[PDB]
Amino acid sequence: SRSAKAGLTFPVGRVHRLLRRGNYAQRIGSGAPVYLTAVLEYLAAEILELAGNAARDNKKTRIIPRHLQLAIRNDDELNKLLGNVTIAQGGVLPNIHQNLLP
Amino acid sequence: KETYSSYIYKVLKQTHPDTGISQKSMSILNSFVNDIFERIATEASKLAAYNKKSSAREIQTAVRLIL
Amino acid sequence: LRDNIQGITKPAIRRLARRGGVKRISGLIYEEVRAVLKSFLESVIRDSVTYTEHAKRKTVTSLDVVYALKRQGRTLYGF
Amino acid sequence: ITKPAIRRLARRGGVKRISGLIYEEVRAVLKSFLESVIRDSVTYTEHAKRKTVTSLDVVYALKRQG
Amino acid sequence: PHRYKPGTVALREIRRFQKSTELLIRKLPFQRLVREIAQDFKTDLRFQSSAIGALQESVEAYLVSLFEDTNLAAIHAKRVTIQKKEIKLARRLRGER
Amino acid sequence: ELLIRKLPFQRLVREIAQDFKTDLRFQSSAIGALQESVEAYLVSLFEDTNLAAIHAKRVTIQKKEIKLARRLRGE
Amino acid sequence: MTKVLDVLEQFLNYHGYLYMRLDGATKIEDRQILTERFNTDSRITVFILSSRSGGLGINLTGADTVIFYDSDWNPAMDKQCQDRCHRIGQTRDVHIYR
DNA sequence: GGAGTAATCCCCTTGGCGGTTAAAACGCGGGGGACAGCGCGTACGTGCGTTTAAGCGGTGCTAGAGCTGTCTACGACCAATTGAGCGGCCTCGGCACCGGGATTCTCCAGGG
Numbered sequence: 001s002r003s004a005k006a007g008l009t010f011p012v013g014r015v016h017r018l019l020r021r022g023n024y025a026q027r028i029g030s031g032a033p034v035y036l037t038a039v040l041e042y043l044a045a046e047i048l049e050l051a052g053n054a055a056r057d058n059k060k061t062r063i064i065p066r067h068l069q070l071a072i073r074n075d076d077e078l079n080k081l082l083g084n085v086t087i088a089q090g091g092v093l094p095n096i097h098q099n100l101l102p
Numbered sequence: 103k104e105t106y107s108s109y110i111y112k113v114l115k116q117t118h119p120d121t122g123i124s125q126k127s128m129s130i131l132n133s134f135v136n137d138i139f140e141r142i143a144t145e146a147s148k149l150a151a152y153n154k155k156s157s158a159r160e161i162q163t164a165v166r167l168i169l
Numbered sequence: 170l171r172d173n174i175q176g177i178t179k180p181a182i183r184r185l186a187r188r189g190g191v192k193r194i195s196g197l198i199y200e201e202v203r204a205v206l207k208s209f210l211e212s213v214i215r216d217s218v219t220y221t222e223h224a225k226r227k228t229v230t231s232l233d234v235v236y237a238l239k240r241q242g243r244t245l246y247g248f
Numbered sequence: 249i250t251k252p253a254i255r256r257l258a259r260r261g262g263v264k265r266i267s268g269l270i271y272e273e274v275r276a277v278l279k280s281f282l283e284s285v286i287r288d289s290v291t292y293t294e295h296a297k298r299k300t301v302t303s304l305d306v307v308y309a310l311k312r313q314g
Numbered sequence: 315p316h317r318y319k320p321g322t323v324a325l326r327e328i329r330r331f332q333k334s335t336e337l338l339i340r341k342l343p344f345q346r347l348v349r350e351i352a353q354d355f356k357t358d359l360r361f362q363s364s365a366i367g368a369l370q371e372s373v374e375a376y377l378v379s380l381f382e383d384t385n386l387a388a389i390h391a392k393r394v395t396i397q398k399k400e401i402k403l404a405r406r407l408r409g410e411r
Numbered sequence: 412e413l414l415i416r417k418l419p420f421q422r423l424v425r426e427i428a429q430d431f432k433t434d435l436r437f438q439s440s441a442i443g444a445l446q447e448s449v450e451a452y453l454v455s456l457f458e459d460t461n462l463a464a465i466h467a468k469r470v471t472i473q474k475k476e477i478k479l480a481r482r483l484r485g486e
Numbered sequence: 487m488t489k490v491l492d493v494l495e496q497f498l499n500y501h502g503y504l505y506m507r508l509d510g511a512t513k514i515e516d517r518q519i520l521t522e523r524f525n526t527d528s529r530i531t532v533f534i535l536s537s538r539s540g541g542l543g544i545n546l547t548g549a550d551t552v553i554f555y556d557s558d559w560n561p562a563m564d565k566q567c568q569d570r571c572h573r574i575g576q577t578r579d580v581h582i583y584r
Numbered sequence: 585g586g587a588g589t590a591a592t593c594c595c596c597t598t599g600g601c602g603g604t605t606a607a608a609a610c611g612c613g614g615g616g617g618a619c620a621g622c623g624c625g626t627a628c629g630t631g632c633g634t635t636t637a638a639g640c641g642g643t644g645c646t647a648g649a650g651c652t653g654t655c656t657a658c659g660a661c662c663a664a665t666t667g668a669g670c671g672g673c674c675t676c677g678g679c680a681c682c683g684g685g686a687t688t689c690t691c692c693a694g695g696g
């Protein structure tokens with residue numbers, strides 16, 4: 001493959017063309033054009049582990065968007081990154097106030 | 103056409119051999135991974151223009167500050 | 170060929186409150202939240218029509234909703 | 249901040265009836281916000297190829313989030 | 315007539331409505347409101363297929379977050395349920411304009 | 412200017428920031444801007460909690476008034 | 487033809503018989519009620535239908551005569567349309583006028 | 585012998601209905617939510633007798649700062665070859681909300 005230089009496996013060719021021509025830096029001079037794919041592999045692996053754990057539980061084997069919404073709201077680093085996003089095909093965090101409650 | 107899915111399942115086999123996931127999770131993966139790519143590219147664009155030094159440290163600073 | 174709203178439910182607005190953490194109700198629960206909906210949506214579409222009338226151009230694929238709502242102040246994921 | 253500065257703040261202070269409450273509260277997030285802004289400044293000035301904080305490398309410190 | 319105390323049966327309503335992926339918004343007229351909004355000023359949209367679901371779920375996010383903020387401001391006051399003044403508090407502080 | 416005098420806030424800033432990096436120094440600038448921004452945030456929170464107290468049927472704001480002022484202003 | 491369906495209405499208005507149609511000339515809440523209106527006996531005498539919409543996917547039993555007007559592509563469909571008039575509630579023969 | 589006129593395909597709309605369920609609302613009971621005035625006191629109110637510090641201004645250079653020769657250290661063209669995962673498919677493991685079975689959730693009128 002063209003990605004196994006440092007444990008990566010995502011496609012490189014089109015990614016090499018895009019990162020080299022990212023239109024944001026004049027030249028990536030020594031230089032980590034593959035670090036975008038590195039963080040991409042990192043996120044893919046963490047999503048793999050989380051989704052496997054979620055699907056394997058609930059006595060099922062599939063990921064319902066409810067589970068992914070719960071996982072997205074679960075993390076704190078993702079909340080600090082972009083905390084102004086919501087997940088569709090699910091529901092809001094359940095809530096009842098003790099003052100609302102009888 | 104082009105699918106990251108095969109590489110994703112390669113990493114899964116590195117982690118878990120016989121687990122199945124859903125397609126909606128794959129679409130959300132596409133969206134969030136690509137917007138992370140856009141944000142990380144946007145963050146490390148003109149940092150090399152902050153001072154007259156215009157690499158790896160640009161994206162390193164990007165991941166340092168977004169996280 | 171245009172259609173307009175009728176009041177936004179007793180029941181479905183009640184479930185909206187239910188997932189908002191509400192069991193009983195006041196007289197100021199059903200109607201006004203929809204008014205906030207209308208005000209926020211009219212503001213965001215005001216910005217959108219300003220954008221599309223300053224240059225007089227159309228829009229692009231479904232990736233607009235996530236970016237426009239993020240600038241608005243509440244965006245979404247799911248695909 | 250000390251008692252007289254908070255006293256003037258409470259003099260503004262909604263007819264001064266909010267004095268004790270703001271005396272107790274407004275000092276809780278002072279250090280938190282200060283730490284946040286100085287940490288952001290440190291992160292911005294990390295990539296400056298210099299040895300001291302300069303205004304050159306902190307112009308676009310919060311460009312990501314405004 | 316097994317009529318029990320309201321609030322506890324409202325509590326079971328909350329429990330049922332806050333458990334699964336159920337679409338609590340009986341809201342195709344929400345879609346018609348979106349259509350009236352979109353065709354209010356322009357025309358010839360020619361959009362995607364499932365975009366209505368995404369925009370409606372963003373509407374749900376905004377409105378429901380408003381609901382929880384309003385309920386927090388309501389229990390802040392001496393009124394548990396949703397009040398318009400609490401919604402004004404929740405929206406003005408957000409920087410509504 | 413600086414209602415809380417420049418030297419107290421300067422001492423606090425230096426004491427807090429000494430732990431991040433050794434031998435950290437500032438130029439002639441970046442002295443009075445931090446307190447000004449902090450006070451701007453404080454005044455915005457004051458306006459928000461004053462509005463909340465206007466709603467709360469009591470001029471006296473409280474812990475929860477300031478909590479609502481800070482939380483719903485954006486963060 | 488659409489230009490026949492939009493012209494039969496004024497003929498019915500002029501001749502003044504109670505009528506209703508299985509065509510594109512009703513409202514959203516007059517579909518099942520009108521189906522039972524035809525199913526139940528009444529004073530009506532005029533029911534206008536289409537070739538392939540209301541003439542194949544229905545169970546009309548309150549009719550006696552069949553009127554055709556035209557058939558472009560129907561090698562074996564007009565016989566089925568004529569049969570659609572016929573039902574077990576038709577003790578008499580299905581008259582045909584063309 | 586490729587284009588000019590025009591006969592062909594055709595499919596896609598301009599629009600109006602079957603079939604249709606949810607969408608908003610009624611509707612009655614009441615009891616918990618609606619919103620506040622007082623009790624009084626505690627919750628703040630406040631203005632002058634009593635000081636460290638703050639924001640400095642009197643030499644000499646004094647940690648970081650901008651500084652011009654002339655370059656050391658590198659990152660992007662083309663040309664014949666070729667391997668990664670894509671171009672298309674759907675294989676064997678494990679699915680997927682109310683039933684077999686009903687104790688939970690919630691109130692109420694007599695035991696007590």
Ligand SMILES: Nc1ncnc2c1ncn2[C@@H]1O[C@H](COP(=O)(O)OP(=O)(O)O)[C@@H](O)[C@H]1O
Nearest residue numbers: 540541542543544545546566569570572573574
């Ligand atoms: N043996 C029978 N006895 C009574 N009625 C029948 C019998 N066979 C068929 N039918 C009626 O004839 C109708 C024909 O149905 P079908 O041809 O499937 O669709 P459509 O009614 O639209 O033509 C049915 O609706 C049914 O009620």
